[PDB]
Design a protein around this ligand. Sequence first.
Ligand SMILES: [K+]
Ligand SMILES: [K+]
Ligand SMILES: [K+]
Ligand SMILES: [K+]
Lengths: 259, 259
Amino acid sequence: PPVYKIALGIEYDGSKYYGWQRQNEVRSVQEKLEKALSQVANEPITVFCAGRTDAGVHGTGQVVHFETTALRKDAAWTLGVNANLPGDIAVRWVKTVPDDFHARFSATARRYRYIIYNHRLRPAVLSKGVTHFYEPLDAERMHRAAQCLLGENDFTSFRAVTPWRNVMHINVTRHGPYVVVDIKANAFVHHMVRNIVGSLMEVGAHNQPESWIAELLAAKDRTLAAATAKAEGLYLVAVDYPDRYDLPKPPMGPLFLAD
Amino acid sequence: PPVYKIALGIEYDGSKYYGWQRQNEVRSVQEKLEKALSQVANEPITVFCAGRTDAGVHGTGQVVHFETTALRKDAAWTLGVNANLPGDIAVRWVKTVPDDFHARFSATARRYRYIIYNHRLRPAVLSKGVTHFYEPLDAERMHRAAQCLLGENDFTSFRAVTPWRNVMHINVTRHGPYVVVDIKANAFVHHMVRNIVGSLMEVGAHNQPESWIAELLAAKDRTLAAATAKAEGLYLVAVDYPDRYDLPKPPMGPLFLAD
RNA sequence: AGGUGGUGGAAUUGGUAGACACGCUACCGGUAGUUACGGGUUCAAGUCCCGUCCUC
RNA sequence: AGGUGGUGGAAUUGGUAGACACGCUACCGGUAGUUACGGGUUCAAGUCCCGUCCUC
Ligand SMILES: [K+]
Ligand SMILES: [K+]
Ligand SMILES: [K+]
Ligand SMILES: [K+]
């Protein structure tokens, strides 16, 4: 028998499942995906995702892979799949990927995106999927201050307690009344991202200094900075890989929000 | 007793209710809004909305009004309300509006917005709320051809069978992989909007002539043009009013999608 | 000057209260389990008045 | 050349089938109610093969 390895770019609005990973009781993405996906090969399939993203967390670039003895025409895998998939999980693309690949492992670096309302007045354009902030923010600052964590420092101050991850780019802008964050750090420590935002969103609305970003970073402490950033607003928009593999990689959303 | 009239800009993701208007059995916006809203004055309230928008139809500018003998500090009306409101209905603003006002009636002209995916691959960034199209579209055209219904003609060709409504602006663009439509016609005939899109979306993917827009318009027939446009993708982003009244009017979404 | 779940610690500074972190018991990363009292005003009270009983 | 709910009329041209329109019975704008047959291949068949029985 020939086992075929193929990773696929899946896309999923969180909001309603309890995160990625399984565990007999409730319901997860993987659960959903695993099942459907495997139903289409009669050989019970198990997926290997590249970012065990948890509850109320969205993805639009999450990519997974797996092996099988079954064979398709790139269709069951694309069109097929999300057909047996609940309208909040989709496939985006597929690729006959070389055995030496790994999703979690071949991975080289990630990129998340944080969204936020600001009207002072909870949105209705779907709750779960944005988190809105009250008191008025300041982009110029948000981004202004954050832009220095790219150094590389001890993020031990943002790990919910190797605290040496490498940041490549920060970026905090206000496309509309929303403010949008994005980062492409080599790797990530627990939440972080999230504890970053809070501890950055704080600076946004003032209440804290502009320079303060460098304080707690250097300070090197979690039990100092701002509260972890809600949840319903994270967007894993794509994980970076090597070009040997050559994945298909399209617009990372989460919506019009251009790459 | 002094009855107070006040209209308020409400915002609502459709998707899950069965439209605006009530009727003992199921569940509607108005139902939701009516209730909550009225709970906050102990005088059973009835709303008067300015666009009885139906099932799976979104609003982000829908505005309603009503009268009451109760009195507030602009808070129960804003913050209060959507607190007693399900996360898919929000208030956006309120205004102590002059008795001579009317929501449906004082209205002068409307503006809808249509969204669409195009990946060939159903999105997961919430279904209900977008409708995605298969075969690849053409904005340059979409908008190119539509731009002539602003004349005013017999739309009797788009009324699901006075078929003389006045169009002020059409507009069909591709902010991202989405294509986005918007129109500000004085008034509207049954669906229309919707039957327009289909009969315009057709031109988008070809299958029909570029000039064809003027054909059926002049043709003056419904049982000729393309199928009515899905549903889960309409966005009543604001209704235009007179400046005597002076409403507060903020960004019309539906998201970052800038005014 | 105040008092919130097994603690710390918050509440668009009248609005689904317990966010966010944290601790031990289970159980195949989860899910379960282990607003001081009495009134009052208001459409609503952790937050506002009258009180009893606490507290550095 | 084909055959789909009370009809017309479609199905990312193997994928939750009945979209979109339309007709009469109720009932305080709604909600209810009034894939030709037998097999086969495939993980899946309105759509693909073998068939019976229809059809301009
Ligand atoms: K206040
Ligand atoms: K045991
Ligand atoms: K095909
Ligand atoms: K009767």
